[PDB]
Amino acid sequence: KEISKDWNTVFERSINTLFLTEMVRGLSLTLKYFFDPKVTINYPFEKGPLSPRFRGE
Amino acid sequence: MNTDITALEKAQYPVVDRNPAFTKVVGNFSTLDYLRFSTITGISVTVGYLSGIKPGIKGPSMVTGGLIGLMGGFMYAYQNSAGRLMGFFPNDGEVASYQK
Amino acid sequence: NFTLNFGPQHPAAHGVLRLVLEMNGEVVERAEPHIGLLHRGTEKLIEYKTYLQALPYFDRLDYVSMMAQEHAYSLAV
Amino acid sequence: YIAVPAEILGIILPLLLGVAFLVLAERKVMAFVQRRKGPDVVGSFGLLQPLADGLKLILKEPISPSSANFFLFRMAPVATFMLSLVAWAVVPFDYGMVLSDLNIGLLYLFAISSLGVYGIIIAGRSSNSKYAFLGALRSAAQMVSYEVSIGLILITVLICVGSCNLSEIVMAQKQIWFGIPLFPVLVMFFISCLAETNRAPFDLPEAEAELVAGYNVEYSSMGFALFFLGEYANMILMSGLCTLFFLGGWLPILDLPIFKKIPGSIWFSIKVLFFLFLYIWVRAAFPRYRYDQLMGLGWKVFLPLSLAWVVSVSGLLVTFQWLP
Amino acid sequence: MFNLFLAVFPEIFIINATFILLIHGVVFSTSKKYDYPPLASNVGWLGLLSVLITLLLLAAGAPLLTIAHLFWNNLFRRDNFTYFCQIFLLLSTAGTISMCFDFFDQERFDAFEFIVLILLSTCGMLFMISAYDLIAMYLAIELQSLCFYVIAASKRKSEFSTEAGLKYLILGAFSSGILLFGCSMIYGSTGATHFDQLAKILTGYEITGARSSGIFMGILFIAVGFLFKITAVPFHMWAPDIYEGSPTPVTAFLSIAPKISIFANILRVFIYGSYGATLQQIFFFCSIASMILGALAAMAQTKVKRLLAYSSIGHVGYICIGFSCGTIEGIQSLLIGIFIYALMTMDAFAIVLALRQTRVKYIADLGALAKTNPILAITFSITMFSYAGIPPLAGFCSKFYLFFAALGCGAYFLALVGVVTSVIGCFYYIRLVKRMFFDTPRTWILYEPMDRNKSLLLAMTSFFITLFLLYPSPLFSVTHQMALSLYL
Amino acid sequence: MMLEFAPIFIYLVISLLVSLILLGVPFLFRFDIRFYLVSILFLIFDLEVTFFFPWAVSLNKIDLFGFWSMMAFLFILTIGFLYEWKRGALDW
Amino acid sequence: MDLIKYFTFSMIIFILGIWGILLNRRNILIMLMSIELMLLAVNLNFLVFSVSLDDMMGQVFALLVLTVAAAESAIGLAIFVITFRVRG
Amino acid sequence: MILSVLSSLALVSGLMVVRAKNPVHSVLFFILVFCDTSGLLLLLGLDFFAMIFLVVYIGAIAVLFLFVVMMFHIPLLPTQRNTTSLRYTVYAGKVRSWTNLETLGNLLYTYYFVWFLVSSLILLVAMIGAIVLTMHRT
Amino acid sequence: LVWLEAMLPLGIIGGMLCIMGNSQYYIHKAYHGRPKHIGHDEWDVAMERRDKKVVEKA
Amino acid sequence: RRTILPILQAEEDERFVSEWKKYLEYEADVMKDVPGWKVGENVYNSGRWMPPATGELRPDVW
Amino acid sequence: ASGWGITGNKGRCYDFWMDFSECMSHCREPKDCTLLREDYLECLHHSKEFQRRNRIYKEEQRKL
Amino acid sequence: PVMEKLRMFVAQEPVVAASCLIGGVGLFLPAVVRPILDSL
C-alpha cells in the first residue's frame, strides 16, 4: 500500500502534477541550448578532425 | 425578477405573513411536523436497510435511504408549515401566537 | 482477426526488422518476428580464415559495441 | 462592390507563403534546439529552401490512380483547405484590418473548426486501406473530443467580454489581457489547440498510421500536400486565436506612451510568432503521447476542469456585479 | 422567492430522488469491495419508496399547488383535474414498479437503469398533465417517448426486444414529427402558443362562417399525432408487435402510465384548442374502426401478449367514444373507463408476470390451470370477465356509462357499434376461459408459486373489480368533479 | 447589419477556385463501439455549448435567476457525466 | 411573396421526408435521415413564423427542438448498432 | 434570386438523400441539405440559428451518422413599382437594438426556464440510453 | 548573436501576417474612403443609408 | 443617439407623408369606375395606424 | 401574442392582441367585438391590405 | 473521520479535486457572499 497521505505533502504533490512543474523544468532546458553555440561544421570548407593513424585511400 | 405569490383559490383560514421567509417557517415546525419528519426518515432508513441485504450493501443502502427520507420529510414538514402560515391549513396555533 | 506486418524503413525499428503480428483489432495477441534478413553467413566464413583474419567479423556482429565482441574473441583465443 | 476579390487574394497568398516559411521556421528552430544549423546552404539563411522544395514537388510524376470513385479523394483536400481558409475571414488584425465583421464571429469560428473533421474522415475512407482509414478516424475522434474543451474555454472568454464580436473582445482588453487572470485557462486553451491539430505530443494517431503501413495507398504527388498546407494554416489560425482572446489582440503589451511609433498590426504578429515558436518548442521538448491515454486525458482532465473554470468565472463576476 | 416553488415539490423531489438513485447505483455497482453487487432490487425498492413519498407530497398539497399561478402561467397550469390525474398516474406507476420486483431476480436482470428510467419517465408524465402550452406539451411527450425507446430495447439478447424497440422508435419519431408539424402551423396562423390564449382566439369565430385552411389542418395533424401516440386504429401500424416484443414489465408500464397522461393531454387540447367541432369526425371514425378491428382481431390471436395488445386497442376505442360526444357525461364516462381499464390492465399484467416465472408463451400453456392453482385460475377468469363487460363486475360499469354518454349526444350509431363489438369481444374472452377451466390437455405445465407483492396487488385489484358495483359513488363523484374542473 | 456574410461567400468561392488551380498545376505539366460512444458524448456536450452561448452574452440582463437555472442545467449534465465516468465508456 | 416560398419549401421537405421513411421498410438508415429532415422542416416552419409575426415563442421552441432531434438520433443509432450486432 | 437557387439545390439534395445508392453518399447529401438550410436561415436574418445548424446538425449529428455508416457496412403580387419607396422606418427602437442572441438569452433562462430543464433531462436520457444499450466492454 | 538565423523565418511570417491586414485595410480605404467600423448595428446601417442618400441628393 | 432622432424622425415623417399623398393621388386617379371605393382608408377597424405593410419579411437586415 | 419581439422591443401585433383580449375579458358573447379579433388576425398577415393592392394591380391590368 | 478518506481521494485524483474546489468556490461566492454584500 504505497501511501503519501499527509496534509502538507498532498498539497505539494497535487500542485506539481497540476501546474506541469516537471514539464516546465524539462522545457526550460531546451531553451538553454537554443542560445548556445552550435557544434556543427560546414563540411566543404571545414573538415572534421582526424588522426595520423587514419585508414583511407 | 418579478414574483407574485397569489393563489387562485384563496385561503379559507386567517393568513399570517402571506410571503413567509424560509428561516421562519423552518422555525415554525411544531411537534407534529417533527414527528412526521422522524417517521418518514425512519421508514426510509428501514426500507434502505431491509432492501440492501441481498446485494450485500447494507450500510450504503441505509445512507441512501436516509438521504431520501430526510429530503422527503423536510419537504413535507416545510410544505405543512408554509400552508399553515399562508393560511391554507388549519393553523390554529400560530394564529394565536400572532396575537401575542 | 487480421495479421498485418511491419518493416518500416526509417530507423525507428532499427531497420531490417520484419514483424508479422496478429492483433485482436486494437490489442496484439501474438507477434512472430521474421529474422534472417541480415544473415550474412559469418559462421560459415570464419571456418575458412585464419584466427587473425576472422577478428574483424566480430566488429561487424554488434556494431555499437565493437570492442566488446573483440574482447570475447581475444579472451577465447 | 468589386473590391472584395482583391482583399481575398491579399489574405490568401500571404497565408500560403507564410505556411511555407513556417515549415522553414519549424525545421530551423528544431535544428537550433538540437545544436544544429538546419537549412543554410540554399539561399542566404535557408530562405530559398521552401521555394526549392515547391519546385521539386511540382517537377515529379504524380501517382494518381486513386483506385476509387475518382471524386471523394480529390474533394477532401479541397474541403479541408477551403475550411482552413474561410476560418481566416473574421480575424480582426488591427482595427479595420478585418475582412468580415460578423456580429457573432466566435460561434462562427467554433462551427468552422467543428466542420473541419469530415476532410480527414473522407480522406481515410476514400484511401482504400484497412489501417489508414482507421488512423484517420482516430484522429477525427481526437479532434472531436478536444472541440468541447475548446468551446468551454471560448465560453469562459465570452463571459468576461459579454459580446461575441471578435473586434470587441480585443477592445475589452484595454485594462488587462484576460491572460493574467485566466492563465490556467490560457494553458488549457493552448493545450487544446495543440491537441486538436495533431501537432503536439498529442500526435500518435497518425504517427502509427504510417509506421505500420508506410502510406502504401494512392499517394498523389502534391495533391496530398493540401492536407499539410491546411494543417499548417490551422496551426497559424489557432496560434492567432490565443493572442486574440487571452493576449491583447493588437494592444501594446507593457507600454508607456513612448513606443507609439510602431503600429498595432505588428503587435499582433509578434504574439502570433511567439505562440508559433512555443508550438515548435513544445514539439521538440516532449515525447509523444499514446492514444489510449490521449482520450482519457482529453475527457477526464479538461472537460471537468474547463467546466469548473466556467462556473467559477461566472459565479465570481455575478457576486460582485462585475458583468459587462 | 423560495415559496413560489411550493407548487413543484411533487416533481422536484422525484427528480432529486432519481438523481440520488442513479448516483448510488452507479457508485455501488462497480465497487470491488462488494464484488459488483446486483443492486436492481435495492434501487427498485428505493424508487418505490420515493414514488410513495412524492405521492404523499402531492396528496397533502391540495390547498397548495395553486399558489403563484400567475408566475407559473406561461409554463404550466395545474388545477383539480391535473391534481387527480397526477395522483392516479403516480399510483399506477407505483403499482407497476412494485409488481415487477421478482422479474429482476427470477431471470437475473440486475440493471438498475430500468428503475431510474421508469422514475424519470414518470416525472415527464407529471410534466405532461400540468402542461398548458404547446412547447411544454411536446417536451413532456418527448421525455416519456425517449425513456420508452431506451427501455424497450433494454433486453439485448432477444430479437423481439431489439426489433420491437426499433419499431417503437421509428413510429414514435414519425408521430412526434407529425404532431410538431401540426403545432407549427397553429402557431403560424395565430401566434399564441399558450393554451389559454389559443382557446380565446379560436372561440371568436366558427369554422363554418369562414374557412381557415391553416388552423383546421394544424388541428387535424395534432389529432393524428395524438392518435398515433395512443395507437388508435387505423394508426396501429406496429402496436401489437411493440407489446409482444417488449419485456413484460415494460409492457406493464406501457398502456397504463403513458395512455393516462396522453389522454389527459388530449382532453386539455380538445376542450380548449378545438372549437370548430371538427375533431368529432376524426374521433368518431377512428374510434369505430378501433372497436371493430380490435374485436375482430383479438379473436384470431393464439399468444397472450398479442391478445392483451388488441384488448388494449379495443378499450382505447371504447374510451375514445367519449371524445365524440362532447358533454360533461361524455368526459365522465371517458375518465371512468380509463380508470377501470387501468386497474384491469394492472391485474391482467400481474397475471401474466405470475406465469412468466416458467416462460408462458401461448394461450394453450395455461391449460388445466384450475387444478394446479385453482385460486389464480379464478382470479384470471374474473379479470377476463371484467374485460368482457359482464354485469356483476367492474368494467361493465365503464362500458355502461360510455354507452349512456354516447346515447346522450344522439350518436345512435356509436351505441349500436359498441354493443356489437362488445358481443364479439366477449366471445374470444370466453374462448380463453374454456381452455383454462374445461378442457384438460395431455401435458400440464407447472408454475412455481408467486411472491407477496404481486399477490397482494392482485388480491386488492380482484376485490376492487368484483365489489365495485356495491359502492361506486366515490369514483363517480371524483370523475364529475374532474370533468367540471376543466372550466371552473 | 448582416451584409458582412457576402464577403464570406465570395471568399469561399475564391478559396475553392484557388484550391482548383492548386490541384490543376501537375495536370497542366472492424467496428468499435467506443467511437460511437465518443461521438455521443461530443454531441451531448456540444448541445450544452450551444445552450451556453446565449447564456454568457445575456448574463448581465439576468441576475441570480438565469445563473442558477444554468447551474441546475450544469448539475444535471454533471450527474450524467458522473454516471458516464464510473460506468466506464470514458477510457480506452 | 417570400413567406409562401418559405412555407412551400418546408412543406416539400416535410413530405419528402415522409416519402423517404415510407418507401424502404428495411434500410433503417434512410428512415433516420428522413426523420431528421422532418424535424428540420418543422424547425424552419417555426423560425419563419417567428420572423413573420415578430414573436419570440417560435425561436425558443425551435431551439428546444434541436435537443429532441439530437437525442432521437443518438438513441436511434444506439439501437441500430445493437440490431446490427445480431446479423453479420 | 438567391433564395430560389438555394432552395432548389436544397430540394435536389433532399430528394437524392432518400433515393441514394449507398449510405455514404446519402449522408454526404444529408450534410448538404443542412448546409443549404443554414444558408437559407442566414438569408432570413437569424445568424445564431444559422450557425447552430452547423454546430449541431452537420457538426455532431452528421459526424455521428457518418461514423455509424463507416463501420457496420394572400401573396402580394410581384408588382413593386410604388412599394420600395413606401417603407416607413421607425428610428426609435434602432437605438439599443439587440441581436438574435441577447434577445433569446434574455428569456430562455429566466421566464421559460422549466422547458430548458426539460431539455436538459432529455439530454440526460439520451446520454444514459446510449450507454446502457451499447456497453459490451468485453 | 547566433540565434538570429532561427528568428529570420519567424520575422518573415510575421511581416507577411501584418501585410495581410494592411493590404485589405489599404484596399478598403482606397475605394470606400473610410476604414471599416467595428460595430455595424441596424442604427449604424440606417445612418449609412441615409447619409448615402443625402450625399447623392446634395 | 436619443437626442438626435427627433429631427431624423421628423424628416422621415416628411418623406413618408410626401410619398403617401403621392400614392393616394395615384390610387384616386386609377379608380374612377366601380363605385364603392373609398380611396385610402384604415383597414384597421380600431382606427390605430400602422406603417403600410410590405410582402418582404425581415427587410431591415439586407 | 406573447409580446416578446424579435428586435427586443415589442411584438408589433401585441397591442392589438391585448386590446382584443381585454374586450373579451368582459364580453360573454364573442360576436360583440369580433372586429378586434379580425384586426389582430389581419395584423398578423396583412391579408386585407394585400387584397386591396391586388385589386389595384387588377385595375392596372384590365387596361390592356 | 472523513478527513483521511478525503485526503486520500485528493492525493489520487488531483484534477477532480481541483475542479471540485474551483467549482465549489464559484458556487459559494454567489450563494453566500452575494447576499451579505447585498445588505452592505
Ligand SMILES: CCCCCCCCCCCCCCCCCC(=O)O[C@@H](COC(=O)CCCCCCCCCCCCCCC)COP(=O)(O)OCC[N+](C)(C)C
Ligand atoms: C448532502 C447532499 C447530498 C449528498 C449525496 C448526494 C449523492 C447521493 C449519494 C448517495 C449514496 C451515498 C452512499 C455512501 C455514503 C457513505 C456510506 C457509509 O457511510 O457507509 C459506511 C459506514 O456507514 C456506517 O457505518 C453508518 C452509516 C449509516 C448510519 C446513519 C444512517 C443515516 C441516518 C440519516 C442520514 C444522515 C442524516 C441526513 C443527512 C444529513 C460503510 O459501512 P459498511 O462498509 O457497510 O460496514 C461494513 C460492511 N461489512 C460488514 C460488510 C464490512
Ligand SMILES: CCCCCCCCCCCCCCCCCCCC(=O)O[C@H](COC(=O)CCCCCCCCCCCCCC)COP(=O)(O)OCCN
Ligand atoms: C506566458 C504566456 C504563455 C502562453 C502559453 C501558456 C503556457 C503553455 C505552457 C505549456 C507547456 C506544457 C505543454 C505540455 C502539453 C502536454 C501537457 C499535458 C499534460 C497534462 O495534461 O497533465 C494533466 C494536468 O494538466 C493540467 O491540469 C493543465 C491545466 C492547468 C490547471 C490549473 C492549474 C492551477 C489551478 C489553480 C487555479 C487557481 C485559481 C482558483 C480561483 C494531468 O496530468 P496527469 O496525467 O499526471 O493526471 C493524472 C490523471 N489521470
